[PDB]
C-alpha cells in the first residue's frame, strides 16, 4: 500500500515524492493526472506520467480527444493507468498562467469524490501557477474520499506541512 505519508485530515495524506515513482511502487487503483483540456501531456506531472507509460497515455488520450473533444476546465475523464495504475483520472485544474478561473479548482477536486482512493498531485500547483497552499486547502475542504498527495518539491512539501491549519 501507500507508505511514508503524513496524515493531514481524516482522508487527506501527503508525501514528498514524485507521483510517477509513487505510482510505479504502489500501482494504485487510480492515479490522478494534472491534465489540460486537450490531454496534451507535455510537462509537469502529465509529461512525467506520460513518459513513464512510453507515450501510451498520449496515444490513448489523442484517441479520446478525437472521439469526445476536449475536457472542460474543472472536468475529468477516466482512462487507463497503463503500467502505473489501474486507471488514470485526468483532471483539469485551472491554469492561472492562462487566466483560468481559480474558482474552478474546487470543481476540479470534486472529481476525486467519484473514487474511493487516489494517488494525486496538488491540482493547479507547479506549472499551472496557482498557490499550492491554496490548492491543499481546497483539496482538504472538497475531497471526502482518501487522497494520497505526492508533492515533488521538497521545499514546497515542508512549507505545506508547516503552514497547514
UniProtKB/Swiss-Prot annotation:
Q: Where is the Macro domain?
A: 1-165
Q: How does it sit in the membrane?
A: Multi-pass membrane protein
What does its activity-regulation comment describe?
A: Inhibited in vitro by GRL-0617.
Changing residue 162 to L: reported impact?
In strain: Gamma/P.1
Instruction: Determine the domain of life of the protein's source.
Output: Viruses
Reaction catalysed by this enzyme: Thiol-dependent hydrolysis of ester, thioester, amide, peptide and isopeptide bonds formed by the C-terminal Gly of ubiquitin (a 76-residue protein attached to proteins as an intracellular targeting signal)
User: Where does the protein end up?
Assistant: Host endoplasmic reticulum membrane
Query: What's this chain's function?
Result: Responsible for the cleavages located at the N-terminus of the replicase polyprotein. Participates together with nsp4 in the assembly of virally-induced cytoplasmic double-membrane vesicles necessary for viral replication. Antagonizes innate immune induction of type I interferon by blocking the phosphorylation, dimerization and subsequent nuclear translocation of host IRF3. Also prevents host NF-kappa-B signaling. In addition, PL-PRO possesses a deubiquitinating/deISGylating activity and processes both 'Lys-48'- and 'Lys-63'-linked polyubiquitin chains from cellular substrates.
User: How is the subunit organization of this protein annotated in UniProt?
Assistant: May form homohexamers. Interacts with N protein.
What is the protein named? Papain-like protease nsp3
Amino acid at each position: 500500500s501507500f507508505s511514508g505519508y503524513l496524515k493531514l485530515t481524516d482522508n487527506v495524506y501527503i508525501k514528498n515524492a514524485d507521483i510517477v515513482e509513487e505510482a510505479k511502487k504502489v500501482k494504485p487503483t487510480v492515479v490522478v493526472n494534472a491534465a489540460n483540456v486537450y490531454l496534451k501531456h507535455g510537462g509537469g506531472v502529465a509529461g512525467a506520467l506520460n513518459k513513464a507509460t512510453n507515450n501510451a497515455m498520449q496515444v490513448e488520450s489523442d484517441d479520446y480527444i478525437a472521439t469526445n473533444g476536449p475536457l472542460k476546465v474543472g472536468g475529468s475523464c477516466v482512462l487507463s493507468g497503463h503500467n502505473l495504475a489501474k486507471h488514470c483520472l485526468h483532471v483539469v485544474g485551472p491554469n492561472v498562467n492562462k487566466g483560468e478561473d481559480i474558482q474552478l479548482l474546487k470543481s476540479a477536486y470534486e472529481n476525486f469524490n467519484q473514487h474511493e482512493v487516489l494517488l494525486a498531485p496538488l491540482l493547479s500547483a507547479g506549472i499551472f501557477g496557482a498557490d499550492p497552499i491554496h490548492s491543499l486547502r481546497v483539496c482538504v475542504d472538497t475531497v471526502r474520499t482518501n487522497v494520497y498527495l505526492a508533492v515533488f518539491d521538497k521545499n514546497l512539501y515542508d512549507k505545506l506541512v508547516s503552514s497547514f491549519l
